[PDB]
Design a protein around this ligand. Structure first.
Ligand SMILES: CSCC[C@H](N)C(=O)OP(=O)(O)OC[C@H]1O[C@@H](n2cnc3c(N)ncnc32)[C@H](O)[C@@H]1O
Length: 509
């Protein structure tokens, strides 16, 4: 029962949630659930990042106070995650009181280590990215200043702000990345982060004067904290900071994994660790940056109205079918395309057929031909034993894949096994054998059928992280109790004589 603390990046509630958000929550819910089934004590944090201009500007364009849009749109994210069956332990909002408190304390410590200082800032702020750029990192295109990287507009900003002594931590960071090879995944993202930090870091503005929407800097009410300082702090707040001598913080911090997307990696792999080093806090163990998801182009909303609502998509296709597609279509870490044709055919071949047809055809035979009881198998032939051996070795393989955030390869391995089982079912042809008078073929019918059920049972157990309801539905159909559904149950075979209730379809769609 070792602790495992796993977090998602928290979303700006400035707009409705797109599929990219639901991708991050689903991948992380898969990891969370796998760990619970594998006997870890999981704390799973998600939520919203309610401060900053980006949110304040969306409020004024609506014609409403900022805190109103914050609570309303935060509820939409929360309700969306309920629908997608995200098993978060806490949903953190940055307006929360204890969060305000956690941030003040983090600042107090960075002050107390001599890493915050007042100075004049001049430069370009992108409200859409909540982030500063130097003039070199912007282009003038038809009389409009856009960032070179993202193509987003920028604002000239002259203010007096508190800075963080980020340049002091360049080599301590490089030391850390070197000593902890698995701190940043995937490996492509690691070498990018190492490139940037080797170029040298400049000090970082961490307060704002021009607006009041945010956590006030302690002993300087005239300032609010840069939204990213307070936002990163949510991970500390999710484990009971500032009370560092509490059960939660002692148990769960340091976080075992931050799931984020590749655009916010610098905040998590450079700025966040430096703040923590400054404040004398233990760093997180690992950061996995997942790739973007397109609609044949990045989803642009207004530029191209090609957004994909995951709640619509979940009602359109089923929650579990969407969670399977997102974790199967794309290799986790790389960029990928969503398309309406790709998902339907994926759901059709992988779930409707390879999995669900195999289950219905075996579970129906049990109901018709065997009085709805699990059969007693005899001596397993070599083809039976080879199928049972691949399936008995899945838990180890899938476990390895989940520990590198390669959920896609776990699913591939589980489906290569199902593909063997279908071929096995075709070549053993039990539909022939059930209609026979000799007791040899009747025992042989009972054996083949038992194997197919025992294989499907294993698949169901291992698919619980990705498809909780549909996995559970199959385990119901195989007569499994509510205490025989953890990964310990993978090792314990399907007992002959169990009553299987009358087959209903797992994927009515
Ligand atoms: C202390 S963390 C605060 C983070 C900050 N609050 C923030 O970044 O706000 P956010 O609401 O835009 O968060 C979006 C998250 O979803 C991913 N993402 C977004 N769109 C995506 C897409 N189309 N495809 C794939 N991934 C996507 C993206 O990488 C990011 O991780």
């Amino acid at each position: 029962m070792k602790p495992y603390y796993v977090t998602t990046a928290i979303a700006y509630p400035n707009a409705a949630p797109h599929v990219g958000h639901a991708y991050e929550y689903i991948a992380t819910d898969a990891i969370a659930r796998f760990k619970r089934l594998d006997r870890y004590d999981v704390r799973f944090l998600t939520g919203t990042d309610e401060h900053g201009l980006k949110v304040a500007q969306a409020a004024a364009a609506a014609g409403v106070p900022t805190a109103a849009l914050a609570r309303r749109n935060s509820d939409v994210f929360q309700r969306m995650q309920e629908a997608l069956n995200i098993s978060f332990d806490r949903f953190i909002r940055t307006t929360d009181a204890d969060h305000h408190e956690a941030s003040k304390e983090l600042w107090r410590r960075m002050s107390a280590a001599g890493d915050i200082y007042l100075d004049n800032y001049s430069g370009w702020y992108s409200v859409r990215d909540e982030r500063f750029f130097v003039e070199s990192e912007t282009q003038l295109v038809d009389g409009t200043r856009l960032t070179v990287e993202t193509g987003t507009p920028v604002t000239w900003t002259e203010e007096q702000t508190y800075f963080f002594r980020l340049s002091a931590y360049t080599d301590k960071l490089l030391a850390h990345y070197h000593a902890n090879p698995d701190f940043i995944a995937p490996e492509t993202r690691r070498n990018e982060v190492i490139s940037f930090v080797s170029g040298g870091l400049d000090d970082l503005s961490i307060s704002r004067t021009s607006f009041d929407w945010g956590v006030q800097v302690p002993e300087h009410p005239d300032h609010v904290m840069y939204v990213w300082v307070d936002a990163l702090t949510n991970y500390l707040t999710g484990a009971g900071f500032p009370d560092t001598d509490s059960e939660l913080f002692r148990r769960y911090w340091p976080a075992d994994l931050h799931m984020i997307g590749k655009d916010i990696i610098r905040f998590h792999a450079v700025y966040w660790p430096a703040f923590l080093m400054s404040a004398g806090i233990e760093l997180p163990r690992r950061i996995f940056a997942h790739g973007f998801l397109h609609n044949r182009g990045e989803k642009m909303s207004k530029s191209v109205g090609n957004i994909v609502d995951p709640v619509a998509l979940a009602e359109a296709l089923g929650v579990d079918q969407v969670r399977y597609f997102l974790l199967r279509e794309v290799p986790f870490g790389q960029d990928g395309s969503y398309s309406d044709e790709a998902i339907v055919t994926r759901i059709n071949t992988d779930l409707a057929n390879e999995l669900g047809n195999l289950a219905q055809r075996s579970l129906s035979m049990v109901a018709k031909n065997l009085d709805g009881r699990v059969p007693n198998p005899g001596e397993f032939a070599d083809a039976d034993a080879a199928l049972l051996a691949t399936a008995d070795g899945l838990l180890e393989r899938v476990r390895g894949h989940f520990d590198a955030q390669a959920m896609h390869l776990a699913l591939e391995a589980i489906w290569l096994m199902l593909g063997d089982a279908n071929k096995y079912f075709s070549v053993q042809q039990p539909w022939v054998l059930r209609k026979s008078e000799s007791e040899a073929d009747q025992a042989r019918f009972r054996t083949t059928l038992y194997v197919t059920c025992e294989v499907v049972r294993i698949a169901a157990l291992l698919i619980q992280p990705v498809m909780p309801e549909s996995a559970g539905k199959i385990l119901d159909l195989l007569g499994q109790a509510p205490n025989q559904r953890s990964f310990a149950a993978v090792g314990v075979r399907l007992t002959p004589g169990t009553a299987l209730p009358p087959p209903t379809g797992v994927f009515p769609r």
